[PDB]
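User: I'm writing a short methods note and want a consistent example. For Peptidyl-prolyl cis-trans isomerase FKBP1B, I'll paste the sequence; you return only the structure tokens, no commentary, since I'll be parsing the reply automatically.
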Amino acid sequence: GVEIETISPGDGRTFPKKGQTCVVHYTGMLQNGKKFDSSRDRNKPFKFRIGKQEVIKGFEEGAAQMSLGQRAKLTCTPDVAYGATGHPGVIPPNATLIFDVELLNLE
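Assistant:
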């Protein structure tokens, strides 16, 4: 389950493909909670590739459903990233994660 609410401006066609190192200014958020992880804070806009399962499935499936310039809004289900496990100190178990994802990518 990936619920995408794209803020419209972009190009609508430059989709991430397999092995494409793509760039996302992500900004994390917890449902009824604050931020937990931000490439905007680091100003290091997370050059990641598609097809290696580096990112979680809630963040990976949201990337291919966007295009260049688009600004979507992830609502990541718990069971795809940390629902039973939970990260120690960052992500609790059974958290519905929120992301400000804008696909301003490369390749």
